[PDB]
């Protein structure tokens, strides 16, 4: 399984969900989704997984 | 490298990008109501030491006062984000409000900023926790048993 | 630490932001609203003795009414908070209703207060919880089971 | 497992979490998930988990 | 075409998507806002330094101004999602506010430019991971257990 | 098809679908405007070889002009599709808004250009995959395993 994410909601954060299993980190940094406006239509959450 | 950026010159931006003195449809020119934005800005750097973290401000020594002719020591990096979380405690000065697109950009802005701090601090280990005899703590290392704390 | 707060500046700041005693309008102060702020205030700091906790205000002793001119005694970093929350306790004596903005910079300044304020306390173990075998209770400490007292 | 949180819900807040296998804390604080005009619209809990 | 792409050029391409000033017009603003719409341009190139990432944009050395005859350093694939920005921000200055397809048109130009500056990561394999026999790490190569990090 | 189609028929087309120029308006062409298309519809170009590819637009070459007279080697099934495209982004110079019929024509032109231009990659195999022992690698073919690369 691999989460599946947007490109602007992962951008500037990819070393931290690169090194996931190494280093332990306390938690994971993420941005929510917005639409054009820049209003918050959905979570911090990857939007899902592969099958 | 590049020019360094003052004080007084983020407060000049600030009011710039809410047409209250510019040069863009203004001849009625600023009043010297500048030291009321520099203090401002000084006090919420002095906020800002708490949640956001330092960034690098430079405050006055001594008892003295701002001016706005001091360096302010930020990099022109963070000029955006700052201008524009100073600009929205300013309006209401002015008894004015903000539209939907200035708030867009200084929540771009400020996210901008955020991203060039994160440390996601990477907890330890338990400190009664063994370590395994692979790592062979006799000889090479000491002290089977982490040490978790330092 | 630069200057001193003093009462007054605190006072002032406030009725500045909402346009009510400032040059960036049509505007001058009277006396006796500031004596009035400054009892608002004075009972105000009086009262967060209990929900968010001493901050290290200095009140006045206890013959003498407070004075603009006073020193308040609190970091610089804690002026907007202030500041904010006295405004918002100011503002029905002059009939007014604070716009949405103003809302949004108080809860961020007291939301950047009482961050630099909590504790977590953190729970002790029991008191009839046993200490194992393992800590050697005899010989290097004394009292197996846990004192869990203070 | 890794919780998933936003930048600014967490910024002031890391060392509660970084040590909350260590100590014994009677809970944890977090902040609340807020738009651009200072309006909630999420709980004080993570995000989520990853998988 | 292929010819470079000046500074001055990308804000006067901004200014003329909403009709501020054009080669049609009748009015052509001022050189004020020239120099304000350059320097604008300057600082959000300085803050896309961060989150975007470097596109090649080429700064000012020195102490001197940026000017609007320099050469920008950018590929014309990008002039459309960075006038459209640079519109987004500096609108303000003139109080207006953007159309729903102004704003469809700032995001597509936007995620064109995003695709264009993937990498993702593909993490590594650990350092306590066997490699097994199957691969001969007795002679052919050396090392059993990955490296995993170099 | 047949008739080449040159960069200054195409922003022809643009300005005709949403009235503006036209050959039946009693108004100018402004040959300003036809520079300002020929340009947009370069940029545009330049931008398209990422996210759509590329589908055999002329770029000029050296460094002079777009020069609209000249040819933009596109197949004529493409017209309306690039014609929309362009319609979209400059129409905000006058100042109008489109209708929901212009969008819905925009979005099924560009839904038939996109439809033949799909690869759908297909997957291979791994590499350290085997091939079973009814392929006869020994003697029909050889490398037992799939290649999984080249």
Avoid: C
Avoid at chain 2, 41 to 66: C, H, K, R, V
Avoid at chain 2, 86 to 105: A, F, G, I
Avoid at chain 2, 123 to 136: A, I, L, T
């Amino acid at each position: 399984q691999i989460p599946i994410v947007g490109m602007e909601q992962i951008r500037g954060l990819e070393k931290h969900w690169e090194a996931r299993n190494k280093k332990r980190p306390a938690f994971l940094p993420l941005r929510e989704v917005r639409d054009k406006s820049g209003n918050i239509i959905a979570g911090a959450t990857p939007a899902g997984y592969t099958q | 490298m590049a020019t360094v950026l003052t004080k007084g010159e983020i407060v000049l931006f600030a009011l710039r990008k809410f047409a209250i003195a510019s040069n863009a449809s203004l001849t009625d020119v600023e009043p010297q109501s500048i030291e009321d934005g520099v203090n401002d800005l000084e006090d919420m750097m002095s906020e800002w030491m708490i949640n956001p973290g330092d960034i690098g401000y430079a405050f006055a020594t001594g008892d003295e006062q701002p001016l706005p002719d001091d360096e302010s020591g930020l990099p022109r990096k963070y000029k955006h984000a700052v201008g524009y979380q100073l600009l929205l405690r300013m309006l209401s000065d002015y008894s004015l409000e903000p539209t939907p697109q200035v708030l867009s950009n200084a929540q771009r802005s400020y996210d901008a900023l955020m991203t060039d701090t994160l440390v996601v601090p990477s907890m330890r280990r338990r400190g009664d926790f063994p370590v395994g005899q692979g790592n062979k703590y006799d000889v090479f290392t000491s002290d089977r048993y982490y040490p978790g704390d330092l």
